């Protein structure tokens, strides 16, 4: 409505900055308040990389993707402001949870939400590049959203154990290498937050994958979920399923599971 108006730009003074989140495990991400509307938010601060992230996020709007609310990118300090997710990241949520609440149908629900955001990124021709539980956020009622904290892990630093063969070997990243990562995510969900390839050391992973070794079905993981895990770990990226197919599968499993859980809830 005026010459220097930008619909994404907030004023730094709109925001009360509070503590850094997660002991600093997320990097420069703070809790903050958008004082106008009260509202607790999260605020990442710091440069091109930062500007790219802001520019990408403006392009992304989906129920299971952490929602951008504003940026402060006119002058330093640079801010990105997103909605706040009250239970923190998925990996720790799983490690700490009451499995009476975080039951089997919830695990399927978590998987359905994540595949749903990824199908969205797939349709939009984006590539996440670092999909993992540590990168998903949890809110109320097992709401899960996909994020990215640019956390890089061992070219660069790599999360070796979530990384597709063609990405480790040839540096080829794609939505199909996300599909492979999503498969490790499934295993993380299935174990409630166990480290992948337990007991195996990082230097051996590729060679083992190339001999066609894959992680075994976790105790209690449904057969069909494992089927999905292993389809995600097809060696040829072209052989992997789409996130559209993946999300379709999990929704269906999810709906079947809740009929059972609700019923079980009634009886108890
Ligand atoms: C302040 C903040 C800023 C940014 C982001 C963020 O995730 N950025 C993001 C950047 C890019 C992409 C997509 N690209 C990936 C790369 N790829 C190469 C291209 C496509 C996506 C994605 F969600 F779409 F994946 C997200 C999260 C937060 C948070 C927070 C928050 C809220 N509640 C809590 C509770 C505890 C801890 N943190 N926290």
Tokens representing residue 153 in the block: 């892990």
Looking at the domain assignment, is residue 267 inside a domain?
A: no
Q: Decide whether any atom of ligand 1 lies within 6 Å of the 29 Cβ.
A: yes
Residues 120 and 133 in one domain: yes
CA of 26 to the centre of ligand 1 (A): 10
Among 8, 17, 22, 42, which is best to mutate for testing ligand 1, by the most ligand atoms less than 8 A from CB?
42
Which residue numbers are catalytic?
130
Q: Which of 57, 84, 111 represents a domain boundary (last residue)?
A: 84
Q: Is the CB of 26 under 6 A from ligand 1?
A: yes
Mutation to probe ligand 1, out of 24, 29, 52 (largest number of atoms < 8 A from CB):
29
Q: Is the CB of 51 under 6 A from ligand 1?
A: no
Q: Which residue, 37, 35, 30, is CA-closest to 81?
A: 30
Report whether residue 127 contacts ligand 1, using a CB cutoff of 6 Å. yes
State the residue for tokens 């992948």. Answer: 196
Q: Which domain holds residue 180?
A: 85-254
207: tokens are 């060679």
Regarding whether 213 and 150 lie in a shared domain, the answer is yes
- Ramachandran category for residue 145: left, alpha or beta (phi over 0 → left; psi -120 to 50 → alpha): beta
Dihedral over Cα of 55, 58, 139, 45: its sign: positive
Please answer whether residues 149 and 135 qualify as being in contact, where contact means their C-beta atoms are separated by less than 8 angstroms.
yes
Residue 86 marked ligand-binding? yes
Is residue 264 one of the residues assigned to a domain? no
Known binding residue 23? Answer is: yes
Cβ(27)–Cβ(150) below 8 Å: yes
CATH number at residue 14: 3.30.200.20
Asked whether residue 56 falls in the same domain as residue 94, the answer is no
Domain end point (choices 29, 51, 84): 84
Judgement on whether residues 74 and 198 belong to the same structural domain of the protein: no
DSSP string, 64-124: TBPPEEEEE-SSSSPEEEEE--TT-BHHHHHHH--TTTS-HHHHHHHHHHHHHHHHHHHHT
* Cis before 221 (ω within 30): no
**Same domain, yes or no, for 80 and 93?**
no
Closest CA to 166 of 220, 218, 237: 237
What number does the ligand 1 atom closest to the CA of 44 have? 1
**For residues 221 and 185, what is the distance between their CA atoms, to the nearest angstrom?**
13
Pair (244, 124) in one structural domain: yes
| Phi–psi pair at 20, nearest 5 degrees | -75, 135
- Residue 226 maps to a domain: yes
Domains of the chain: total:
2
For this PDB entry, the determination method is X-ray
């Amino acid at each position: 409505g005026s010459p220097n108006y930008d619909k994404w730009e907030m004023e730094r003074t709109d925001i009360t900055m509070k503590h850094k989140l997660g002991g600093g495990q997320y990097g420069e991400v703070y809790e903050g308040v958008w004082k106008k509307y009260s509202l607790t938010v999260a605020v990442k601060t710091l440069v091109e990389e930062f500007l790219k992230e802001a520019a990408v996020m403006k392009e992304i709007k989906h129920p299971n993707l952490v929602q951008l609310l504003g940026v402060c990118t006119r002058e330093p300090p640079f801010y990105i402001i997103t909605e706040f997710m009250t239970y923190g990241n998925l990996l720790d949520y799983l490690r700490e949870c009451n499995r009476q609440e975080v039951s089997a149908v919830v695990l399927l629900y978590m998987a359905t939400q994540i595949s749903s955001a990824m199908e969205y990124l797939e349709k939009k021709n984006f590539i996440h590049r670092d999909l993992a539980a540590r990168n998903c956020l949890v809110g109320e009622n097992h709401l899960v959203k996909v994020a990215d904290f640019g956390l890089s892990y061992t070219g660069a630093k790599f999360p070796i154990k979530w990384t597709a063969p063609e990405s480790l070997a040839y540096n080829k990243f794609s939505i199909k290498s996300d599909v492979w990562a999503f498969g490790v995510l499934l295993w993380e969900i299935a174990t409630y937050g166990m480290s992948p390839y337990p007991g195996i050391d990082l230097s051996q992973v590729y060679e083992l994958l190339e001999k066609d070794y894959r992680m075994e079905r976790p105790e209690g993981c449904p057969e069909k979920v494992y089927e999905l895990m292993r389809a995600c770990w097809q060696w040829n990226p072209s052989d992997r399923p789409s996130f559209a197919e993946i999300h379709q599968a999990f929704e269906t499993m999810f709906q079947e599971s809740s009929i059972s859980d609700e019923v079980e809830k009634e009886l108890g």
